[model samples]
Target: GPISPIETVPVKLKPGMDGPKVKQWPLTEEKIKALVEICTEMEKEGKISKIGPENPYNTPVFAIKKKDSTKWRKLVDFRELNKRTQDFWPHPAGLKKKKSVTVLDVGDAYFSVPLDEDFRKYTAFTIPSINNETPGIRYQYNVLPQGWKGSPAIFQSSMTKILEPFKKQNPDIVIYQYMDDLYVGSDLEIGQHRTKIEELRQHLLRWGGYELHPDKWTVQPIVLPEKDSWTVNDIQKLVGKLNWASQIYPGIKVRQLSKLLRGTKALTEVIPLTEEAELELAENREILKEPVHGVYYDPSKDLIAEIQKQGQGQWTYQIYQEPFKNLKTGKYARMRGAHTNDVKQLTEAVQKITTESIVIWGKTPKFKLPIQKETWETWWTEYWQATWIPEWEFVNTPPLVKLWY
Candidate 1:
């Protein structure tokens, strides 16, 4: 059973780095005065301090002429407190030994369920108390309660809107998004997959949500059968990127989504067709998480910078750590994407890393470890329930997972 016993394991501490910090401060006097006071007081108290007479961020901040036109941001500006904040222990997400890629088929219209209280009730997830105490019930709703200690809940539609436009522009880069359970399809090379993702980011902001950056929103290559065609070469080569959704499956704290790989038989009580793509994914589940490259993480700031390069919108990563989007301006407003690990740190962003020299191993270990394991489970479970495909629908044999007829 044991492949081989360990002799002298070389513990390689891959260097680390900080993410690209895009600070979205306000255009107000109160924020400016506050930063100045904090800097001056720190200097007065004998600590490192600096406050510029002019704007520090080196970006323009505009005030909206109309209340309805100005978009709301999910933000917190902790630039002043960055020094005081304690470093959180890094959470790691890794890569597969042997990898393959696949494309998915979205029948026609990509349907989604928006955030609603009724949907929350069905996906009841409770956090068990420590020290053998009773568990408490918690679920996500659109209007998160204020002063509530739990992190703010993000709408599934947020992720859905991000890919919707990219799907339209490059119809070849088709996708079916239901919150975070997204299927962005294309038979392009990894580079095109990267491009589609960048395009997807712009789409999300245009649709009024933050694009997840400073994290591994990276995609992998997959091969599978075409929609109606199953053969020796039905393997759709160079498929485009998904949300890299498979990354979210393995580390589900308590819940298990074993049903995801299975095919869907009956479309609905009204419709009789089953999902062909589901059947295909089930067949090649083993080769999904192969390693693309062995990334030697930089402690200074390398990988996160690469991930953050595509980020846009009013709220960037740096403004998320603290409570206000700006510690220096008046026109500044609170924004979202502040609550995600992907936004908070690079560790929250990585999907996978790999070993030196390709040792193609097990079902190749396809695991998607979300940065904040606790809340994302809640986010994902509800997302799936809304887009439930019955277990009976999964046909064991590999049929096909394609787009065009």
Candidate 2:
């Protein structure tokens, strides 16, 4: 596909500001060849154009080895240019998880959005001379460059406008746009999903000149379990997966995996998993195997606060959306519980709940804790002043029984 029809506003410079020309860095023979190859491919794709030495701006370009250790990705040092550029702020859309999903990535996504021609000279980057045989090349981006700070906001705004009509026409299909990655989700069958995806691809090409990457498209991909010892990064990945799954299923206990998340000073540090950690991971995996019941949260619905006093100073509570459904076969499966022993923490939670909605207490909460009368009175007065609910009602009905019971 060619460049997008939507053109970005030209970058504005501060008053009395001129483009900076930074010194180029030295590179090895191998790195020079790699960078030249990358630039050549980019030029062929019309993403960048060769520029003369008369260009006002020149930023140094460098390459860093990718995670795979076999390939290198070229990055430009655009800090100086970014400092002089005017700021832009765009409201971003929120992301939600769904049962069935298709992940689509745009091929050379940032490069598909065109930059104003007048500002192209300000993005010029120089390639150092190779062995003094061939003169260095100066190239400027014709499209939005990756390293520019405003690229994401610009690209997101353009994409949101382009997809507005499609979203309104097909409200049943849930589409999440994070930069160039599109996550399409629906309750339709696999056959219907294919049809919708094809329609969406055509819509992008016709309206925005965006093409999906052929190899990166995925439909209902499975998340395989991790095997062997774990690192901090591994635990963090599992926490992310569990968190997303919990939003839909509401049965995966994320707190159970918290123990595995501790004592990691660095991401790559290998941590020894104790028996409890292993058991917790296994239990979470089991819960993940359950079917997604499509139980979504509605903010408009009534909110209920179910509180249980475990001991003298300990308290546990679960906030539930009205008409909550038991998605699985566990007591706390429908919602996660917050355990606390501090009066301040408990009051803060209640304050948050009261501000959102009128919470219907499952039981009459005894605000008294295992502290001195004077201390309790001081704490109560402080919280009472902080979050003063207009009304407090207590129902005389028996507390709702736990699902397990």
Candidate 3:
């Protein structure tokens, strides 16, 4: 059901512009029936409506198998409509550190916000006849269509407004909203964290007609074990999971998993568990097992950016937090390190670090080099002008040299 009290906005089109009437693709009998059933269910829920042929726009619709492999999901090709529709840009939220976090996926996210009636005709879609008994039917969404270009922006803006007061009241809790996915985090214990999530969930349901996906919710962190035999799919899944975890625990070395990723050509391709990959996987798993009490970003802390030339045309860069006081050792220890091999990517990486530093600390980072002056000069000469040159201080400190007897 659509949320009440939220204003619905029309999907505006370019001046004197109209979308092309795209025909639906041919589908098998089973697929046709599945699409029809889905449409009927949505119609009952008032998410979509049956429309007459008078609607000028018609976009193709198709079906895709869900991850479960047992269900089919209907999708619309809104390419033409997207081209003609007016666009909206919204600021994307960045990842933030939190002690404990829970992710909530909003159920029927787009449908929760209604689309203006005037623009619903522009979203008209057609499905092939179920059987020879009846002709093809035309339909349009009464709510925001999934593939529409502006759907995310519109939905995100609406959600921000809806959660504005809630966010203000709950100053202790940190909420990161990325469209339909909401990550609620705090420095509270597990018991208190659970209660906070439940409180927020109830607020969402009562304040708006929004519901969280039952199975997609996560209160506790998930840990995936390393498998002996690896497939391309397995490596990819592991990478995605680790990437998500990296946002919370910066200690997770996601870059090391690239060894296994290199073995992936096809999803089903079997990846050999080479010694390097095996070691990398084991190390990452060990890091995951460690408890993450809190990992906050402090711009005041010093950052070290190190770049090394591995071989001809091969380079690697690493950025780490300066040594900090360790609670257990009562001594200093390096906090975070992110490694990258992409030569072109180094500029952006350095730029990002410097930008963050400049914005907060109002100072550029200094790079301590281990390469000789000659080699450093050559590398600098080649890439200095080609890519970005940030105002960074460089200290050329060559490693100790030893002559072979």
- Model 1 per-residue lDDT tens digits across residues 49-72: 222322222111112111133332
The model with the greatest lDDT is 3
Error of 3 at 224 (Å): 31
lDDT of all the models against the reference?
A: 0.26, 0.57, 0.58
* Ranking, lDDT, top scorer first: 3, 2, 1
Question: Which runs of model 3 end up more than 4 angstroms from their true locations?
Answer: 1-10, 28-30, 63-73, 89-93, 96-104, 107-113, 130-133, 155-158, 169-199, 208-405
Candidate 1: global Cα-lDDT? 0.26
RMSD of each: 26.9, 21.1, 19.4
What's the C-alpha lDDT at position 282 in model 2?
A: 81
Candidate 3, 131-197: lDDT as tens digits: 5457777888888777675676677766777677778988777665433346565667777777778
Of 2 and 3, which scores higher on lDDT? Answer: 3
- TM-score per prediction, in order, is 0.22, 0.39, 0.43
Query: Candidate 2, residues 1-405: lDDT per residue as tens digits?
Result: 256576467666778888768877666676678789999999998888998977767987766552224666666767677667776641112212233456564524678778877788888987776676788888998888866655655677667677888889888876654333456766566677788788888888886512122122222222435678777887777777776666655767656566767663688888777787778778776765665565544443444554343333434444445333321111111121234334454454444333222211211121222244555434532333111222222334443331111
